[PDB]
């Protein structure tokens, strides 16, 4: 028999539990909703759908206030927070009570996420009282459907994914330079021409082009379908028709809207286009009024996103019409703004006034601060937090989407080679979760202007919905705890222990996701005291870890990890986590163990401060490095030799010393010019037993790892001094001729 678990994502405010019998969830149980409430009937059908993917069973939906062996949805308690709820469980029944139908829905999402996926099985719901409410009223995700186009069905899946994470906003970015995606009745060419490009660039603007005509748009009926589908799941769809930049698709369709007058093409490549709407053209203002006039008939959202990001002023500076507008308005350059930044403020003010007259407010990207903020504008801070902080100080509402924390087109792993191709950056789960949306630099009163938190998905490098899921799951799980949970409840270790129960729902709903959190985490800790390299292995779900030391594939039949592996000998280490769902990536490490490994070592000359890492002890930990000299497997020397003494602890017969170096000549990192081995009985007086000089490197020599080994007549020694020269004088062919080069070394092996 299965048991429910209320330790879910996002973590509720208040969870109690008692020593009373649980509620058994078997065939016969009913869901009750208030007579004649369409939303609460839809809430009941949602619970039934969820209970059907969790248990294998159907549960009847019926009108009612009262029932034995029943789950009762009802309205009640305070309206302080409209999205709050109360989930009480006894052996007799289940109550989900909220001040609105949306609060009942988030109460239902909590019951949903508490359940395991166990087909054919009855489930025990332990006796509990859950009081919960979101911290932020605006909890959103953005979706770029211009750069690559996504179908109605894919956008609905995105909306189902929002609901599972208690998010109440879809920011729908439906126009840009590379495609216009909404049918407009007055301007048919916005879709006939504006929705089509000749092809798409390959890689990061590489000059190679995929000459496949690419396009797609939504009809006004299809866009209404999305509004309605989102509205059932208590999600407001905030549309963005980005202006006055990111408008090449509109210019291709109607070139008179641009400063030069064309020619313009729908853009095949990525980045920022200089060709923007002409602020000096009365046709452009009429055009925006007409487009936004049609937009607000489709999208009832009180808030409408006008964009305002990355609008270069270069065309405006040279345009006689834009300069005539500037002259007539008396716009001036001062320390706060250029004339052309004041001209942008005029455009944002014009569309705000039109939308305020039709009962709507505007959101803009933090660039709308340029030339003075529109008096009623909400600011979406994306260029870090600083735009939001300045907006809050001017008493304007802020939605935080900082690219330092919440740009989910960025890589979510350091090892970008093994990731799907992306724009760049590094936003791992831990970084996303560490985000505190309320800046420490704002006064309490200024903090009330932080209304929302949202993560953006730009799709320059996202062509499939499966890859879009990979990029947002499970990073949305971290985001939604930030959006929802109180800041004092946040603990990263605890969140990661809750994540696997949410991934089970990703699996059951057929959602793709990144699997980095499921990896075996390996720590290699030197133990000088014991003369061992201690390997510790962990998973977030504490799944069974199987390992090999002999270089064979680790399987379900290999030895099981029981506690620290104390390595005292050569080893091809490999470990894997065994999971019903599918096995983890294999974590592996070559352990090069010798007479030097975990022995005391001293620097006789200085280690380079910049590339010191864990220090000289790095050269006797049994670990080797690769071509990348920045990992901490390598320590560097510059302006003096690697000159170290290793204490073998007692007199010992030795016959060889081996090192590796890391070469990157472009970075002034060169191979050693000579290696030497001296021995002592007393630790003061050393005698040379072997050496070799290496010639200066030539232009055609490879970068990467070089191996250097000296053999010699067996000799008895307690102390071994190993000396390696860097390049004191970089050779003539190289730009740094005569300057000293870096030397990087990873390990001193002695046998």
Ligand X SMILES: CC(=O)N[C@@H]1[C@@H](O)[C@H](O)[C@@H](CO)O[C@H]1O
Radius of gyration of the chain (CA): 32
Secondary structure letter of residue 368 according to DSSP: G
Task: Tell me if 180 contacts ligand X by CB under 6 A.
Answer: no
Instruction: HSE, CB side, 13 Å, CA atoms: give it for residue 125.
Output: 28
Helical (H) or strand (E) element with 714: strand 704-725
Q: Contacting Cu ion (CB under 5 A), which of 99, 134, 179, 280?
A: 280
Q: Is 147 annotated as a binding residue?
A: yes
Q: Is 310 annotated as a binding residue?
A: yes
CA distance 325 to 244: 15
Please identify which residue in the block is written with the tokens 């946040």. 490
Residues 301-330 that bind ligand X (CB under 6 A): 309-310
CA distance 175 to 213: 18
Q: Contacting Ca ion (CB under 5 A), which of 452, 503, 747, 749?
A: 747
Q: Is 322 annotated as a binding residue?
A: yes
Residues 353-372 that bind ligand X (CB under 6 A): 365
Among ligand X, Ca ion, Cu ion, none, what does residue 382 contact (CB within 5–8 Å per kind)? ligand X
> Near Ca ion by CB under 5 A, which window of 61-69, 172-180, 444-452, 743-751?
743-751
The Cα-based distances of 161 to 158, 430, 468, 477, 502 in angstroms read 5, 21, 12, 10, 12
CA distance 5 to 125: 8
DSSP-assigned states of every residue in 68-106? SSEEEEEE-S-SSSTT-EEEEE-SS-EEEEESSHHHHHH
CA distance 193 to 199: 14
Q: Contacting ligand X (CB under 6 A), which of 458, 505, 573, 629?
A: 458
Helical (H) or strand (E) element with 420: none
Output the smallest distance, CB 589 to Ca ion, in A: 11
What is the dihedral sign for C-alpha 446, 447, 448, 454?
A: positive
Among ligand X, Cu ion, Ca ion, none, what does residue 621 contact (CB within 5–8 Å per kind)? Ca ion
Output the smallest distance, CB 353 to ligand X, in A: 23
Output the smallest distance, CB 623 to Ca ion, in A: 4
Please identify which residue in the block is written with the tokens 């369709």. 253
Q: Is 259 annotated as a binding residue?
A: yes
Among Cu ion, ligand X, Ca ion, none, what does residue 321 contact (CB within 5–8 Å per kind)? Cu ion
Output the smallest distance, CB 460 to ligand X, in A: 6
Q: Contacting Cu ion (CB under 5 A), which of 131, 204, 321, 467?
A: 321
Task: Tell me if 267 contacts ligand X by CB under 6 A.
Answer: no
Output the smallest distance, CB 271 to ligand X, in A: 7
Helix, coil or strand: residue 162: helix
Which residue(s) pair with 95 in the sheet?
72, 88
Q: Is 480 annotated as a binding residue?
A: no
Give catalytic status of residue 289 as yes or no: no
b/e per residue, 682-693, with b = 16+ CB within 10 A? eeeebeebbeee
CA distance 537 to 103: 41
CA distance 20 to 495: 27
Among ligand X, Cu ion, Ca ion, none, what does residue 458 contact (CB within 5–8 Å per kind)? ligand X
In this structure, are strands 674-680 and 687-693 parallel, antiparallel, or unpaired? antiparallel
Max CA pair span of the chain:
97
Task: Tell me if 278 contacts Cu ion by CB under 5 A.
Answer: yes
Among ligand X, Cu ion, Ca ion, none, what does residue 409 contact (CB within 5–8 Å per kind)? ligand X
Task: Tell me if 409 contacts ligand X by CB under 6 A.
Answer: yes
Among Cu ion, Ca ion, ligand X, none, what does residue 405 contact (CB within 5–8 Å per kind)? none
Site string for ligand X, 377-396 (x = CB under 6 A): -----x--------------
Task: Tell me if 623 contacts Ca ion by CB under 5 A.
Answer: yes
Output the smallest distance, CB 402 to ligand X, in A: 11
Bond from prior residue into 244 cis (ω within 30 degrees of 0) = yes
CA distance 456 to 406: 6
> Near Cu ion by CB under 5 A, which window of 277-285, 402-410, 420-428, 675-683?
277-285
Q: Tell me whether residue 250 or residue 607 sits nearer to ligand X (CB atom).
A: 250
Output the smallest distance, CB 322 to ligand X, in A: 22
Task: Tell me if 407 contacts ligand X by CB under 6 A.
Answer: yes
Q: Tell me whether residue 262 or residue 487 sits nearer to Cu ion (CB atom).
A: 262
Helix, coil or strand: residue 616: helix
Instruction: HSE, CB side, 13 Å, CA atoms: give it for residue 677.
Output: 25
Q: Contacting ligand X (CB under 6 A), which of 75, 423, 438, 696?
A: 423
Q: Contacting Cu ion (CB under 5 A), which of 11, 259, 392, 399?
A: 259
Task: Tell me if 621 contacts Ca ion by CB under 5 A.
Answer: yes
Residue 337 CB neighbours (<10 A) = 18
> Near Ca ion by CB under 5 A, which window of 608-616, 669-677, 719-727, 739-747?
739-747
Residue nearest to ligand X (CB): 458
Report whether 742 contacts 670 (CB < 8 A).
yes
Q: Tell me whether residue 194 or residue 280 sits nearer to ligand X (CB atom).
A: 194
Report whether 448 contacts 396 (CB < 8 A).
no
Q: Which of 129, 225, 294, 310 is catalytic?
A: 310
Residues with active-site annotation: 310
**Binding positions for ligand X, rule: CB under 6 A:** 309-310, 365, 382, 407, 409, 423, 458, 460
Binding site for Ca ion (CB under 5 A): 621, 623, 746-747
């Amino acid at each position: 028999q299965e048991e429910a678990n209320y330790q879910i994502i996002p973590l509720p405010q208040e969870i109690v539990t008692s020593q009373v019998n649980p509620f058994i969830l078997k065939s016969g149980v009913k869901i009750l909703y208030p007579e004649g409430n369409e939303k609460m009937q839809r809430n009941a059908q949602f619970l039934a759908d969820y209970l059907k993917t969790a248990t294998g069973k159907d549960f009847s939906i019926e009108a009612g206030t009262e029932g034995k062996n029943a789950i009762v949805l009802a309205l009640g308690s305070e309206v302080e927070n409209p999205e709050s709820y109360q989930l009480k469980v006894t052996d007799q029944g289940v109550t989900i009570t909220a001040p609105t139908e949306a609060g009942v829905f988030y109460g239902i999402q909590t019951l949903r996420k508490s359940l395991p996926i166990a087909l054919g099985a009855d489930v025990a719901l332990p006796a509990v009282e859950i009081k919960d409410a979101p911290r932020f009223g605006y909890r959103g995700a953005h979706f770029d459907v211009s750069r690559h186009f996504f179908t109605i069905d894919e956008v609905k899946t995105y909306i189902d994914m929002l609901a599972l994470h208690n998010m109440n906003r879809l920011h729908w970015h439906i126009t840009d330079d590379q495609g216009w995606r909404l049918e407009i009745k007055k301007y048919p060419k916005l879709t006939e021409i504006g929705s089509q490009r000749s092809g798409t660039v390959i890689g990061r603007n590489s000059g190679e082009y995929d000459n496949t005509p690419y396009g797609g748009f939504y009809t006004q009926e299809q866009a209404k379908e999305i509004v309605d589908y989102a509205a059932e799941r208590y999600i407001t769809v905030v549309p963005e028709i980005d202006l006055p930049g990111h408008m090449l698709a509109a210019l291709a369709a109607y070139p008179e809207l641009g400063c030069t007058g064309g020619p313009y093409e729908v853009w095949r490549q990525w980045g920022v286009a200089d060709d923007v709407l002409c602020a000096g053209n009365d046709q452009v203002l009429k055009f925006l009024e007409d487009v936004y006039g049609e937009l607000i008939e489709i999208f009832p959202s009180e808030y409408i996103h006008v964009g305002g990001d990355e609008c270069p002023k270069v065309r405006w500076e040279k345009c006689p019409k834009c300069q005539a507008r500037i002259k007539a308005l008396g716009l001036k350059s001062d320390k706060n703004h250029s004339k052309e930044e004041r001209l942008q403020s005029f455009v944002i003010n014009h569309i705000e006034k039109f939308l305020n007259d039709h009962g709507r407010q505007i959101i803009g990207w933090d660039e709308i601060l340029e030339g003075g903020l529109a008096p009623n504008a909400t600011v979406m801070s994306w260029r870090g937090e600083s735009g939001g902080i300045e907006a809050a100080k001017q008493k304007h509402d802020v939605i935080m989407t900082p690219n330092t924390y919440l740009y989910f087109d960025y890589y979510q792993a350091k090892d970008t080679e093994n990731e799907p191709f992306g724009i760049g950056g590094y936003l791992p789960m831990e970084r996303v979760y560490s985000y505190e949306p309320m800046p420490a630099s704002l006064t309490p009163d200024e903090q009330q202007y932080i209304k929302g938190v949202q993560a953006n998905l730009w799709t320059e490098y996202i062509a499939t919905f499966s890859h879009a899921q990979y990029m947002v799951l499970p990073r949305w799980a971290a985001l939604c705890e930030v959006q929802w949970s109180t800041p004092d409840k946040k603990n990263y270790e605890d969140f990661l222990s809750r994540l696997p129960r949410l991934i089970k729902w990703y699996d059951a709903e057929g959602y793709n996701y990144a699997k980095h959190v499921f990896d075996v985490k390996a720590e290699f800790t030197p133990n000088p005291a014991d003369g061992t390299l201690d390997i510790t292995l962990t998973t977030i779900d504490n799944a069974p870890i199987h390992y090999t030391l002999d270089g064979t594939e680790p399987t379900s039949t290999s030895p099981v990890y029981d506690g620290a592996l104390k390595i005292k000998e050569n080893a091809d280490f490999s470990a894997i986590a065994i999971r019903p769902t599918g096995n983890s990536r294999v974590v592996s490490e070559k352990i090069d163990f010798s007479k030097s490994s975990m022995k005391p070592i001293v620097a006789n000359q200085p280690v380079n401060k910049q590339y010191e890492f864990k220090g000289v002890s790095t050269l006797v930990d049994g670990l080797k490095g690769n071509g990348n000299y920045k990992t901490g497997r390598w320590i560097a020397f510059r302006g003096n030799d690697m000159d170290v003494t290793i204490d073998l602890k007692q007199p010992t017969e030795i016959s060889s010393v081996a090192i590796s170096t890391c070469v990157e000549k472009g970075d002034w990192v060169f191979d050693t010019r000579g290696l030497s081995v001296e021995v002592s009985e007393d630790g003061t007086n050393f005698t040379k037993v072997a050496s070799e000089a290496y010639p200066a490197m030539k232009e055609t020599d490879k970068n990467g790892v070089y191996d250097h080994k000296l053999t010699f007549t067996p000799v008895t020694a307690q102390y071994v001094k190993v000396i390696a020269s860097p390049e004191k004088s970089i050779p003539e062919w190289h730009g740094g001729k005569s300057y000293p080069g870096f030397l990087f070394v990873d390990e001193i092996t002695i046998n």
